Amino acid sequence: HWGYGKHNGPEHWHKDFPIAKGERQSPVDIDTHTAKYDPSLKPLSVSYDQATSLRILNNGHAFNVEFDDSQDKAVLKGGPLDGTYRLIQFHFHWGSLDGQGSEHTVDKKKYAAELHLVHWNTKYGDFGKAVQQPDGLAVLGIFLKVGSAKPGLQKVVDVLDSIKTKGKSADFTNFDPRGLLPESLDYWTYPGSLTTPPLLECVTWIVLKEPISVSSEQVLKFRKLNFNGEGEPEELMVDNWRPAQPLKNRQIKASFK
Ligand SMILES: COCCNC(=O)c1ccc(S(N)(=O)=O)cc1
Ligand SMILES: COCCNC(=O)c1ccc(S(N)(=O)=O)cc1
Numbered sequence: 001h002w003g004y005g006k007h008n009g010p011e012h013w014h015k016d017f018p019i020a021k022g023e024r025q026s027p028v029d030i031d032t033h034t035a036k037y038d039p040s041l042k043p044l045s046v047s048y049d050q051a052t053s054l055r056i057l058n059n060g061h062a063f064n065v066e067f068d069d070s071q072d073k074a075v076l077k078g079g080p081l082d083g084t085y086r087l088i089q090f091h092f093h094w095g096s097l098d099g100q101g102s103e104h105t106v107d108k109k110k111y112a113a114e115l116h117l118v119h120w121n122t123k124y125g126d127f128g129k130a131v132q133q134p135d136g137l138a139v140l141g142i143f144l145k146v147g148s149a150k151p152g153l154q155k156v157v158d159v160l161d162s163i164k165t166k167g168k169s170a171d172f173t174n175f176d177p178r179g180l181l182p183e184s185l186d187y188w189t190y191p192g193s194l195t196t197p198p199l200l201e202c203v204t205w206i207v208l209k210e211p212i213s214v215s216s217e218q219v220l221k222f223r224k225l226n227f228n229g230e231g232e233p234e235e236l237m238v239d240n241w242r243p244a245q246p247l248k249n250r251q252i253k254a255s256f257k
């Protein structure tokens with residue numbers, strides 16, 4: 001099936017997911033000079049105070065922290081969005097070395113990793129119906145650079161030993177995703193897609209300008225995870241990022257002057 005290796009990686013995905021060559025694919029390079037400030041964007045509202053994390057899962061492509069999305073407990077609104085988008089999960093993409101790992105790039109610069117907080121538009125009732133809609137999803141993307149440790153990430157790092165291999169899950173309640181955000185909510189936004197198969201073109205991307213810093217030890221712990229299941233030959237979970245895709249007929253808007 002699909003992956004990140006030579007024989008099943010991004011350059012192969014189009015054969016089973018032809019939208020891989022579509023008109024609004026993600027990620028993209030964010031050329032900061034050609035992005036345009038958009039005074040029509042409303043203030044962005046990240047409302048995570050009632051977030052209810054449930055579980056962490058190694059799905060063979062990344063690890064997901066899942067949330068209870070049966071009510072409006074952790075939502076994203078404002079910015080480019082109409083209405084309310086409910087948080088369902090977050091995960092990361094990262095590299096084998098600190099000089100790569102992000103999916104979006106900024107003036108071609110790659111960060112060590114990228115966090116994706118995935119939300120679905122509540123007008124569609126649940127995630128599965130939302131991914132049938134051109135405005136079904138909003139993903140908040142946050143770059144990670146290696147420097148000082150991020151205290152609010154440590155609880156994630158500490159549980160990874162229990163989900164080393166594909167299909168493993170563990171209880172992960174009472175985790176506050178607000179500890180993963182940078183100080184500033186300045187962002188760029190554009191219409192795009194899921195960055196993994198099935199590559200559906202449902203996402204309003206909101207990519208924060210300010211990276212968070214994580215320590216070398218924190219990202220090394222990400223790199224000890226496995227793509228494979230237990231008892232299978234070990235392939236380290238590293239470089240699980242899709243490269244930047246053609247911008248095509250899209251303009252990136254900035255929330256800041
Ligand atoms: C199952 O053993 C390996 C044989 N399969 C493959 O090599 C393969 C490669 C690419 C795709 S993809 N990226 O178009 O979906 C799907 C399958
Ligand atoms: C209908 O898809 C089946 C499951 N896939 C997902 O939920 C999914 C969510 C977010 C991203 S990402 N990397 O764009 O944030 C990629 C995939």
Ligand SMILES: [Zn+2]
Nearest residue numbers: 092093116195
């Ligand atoms: Zn992602």
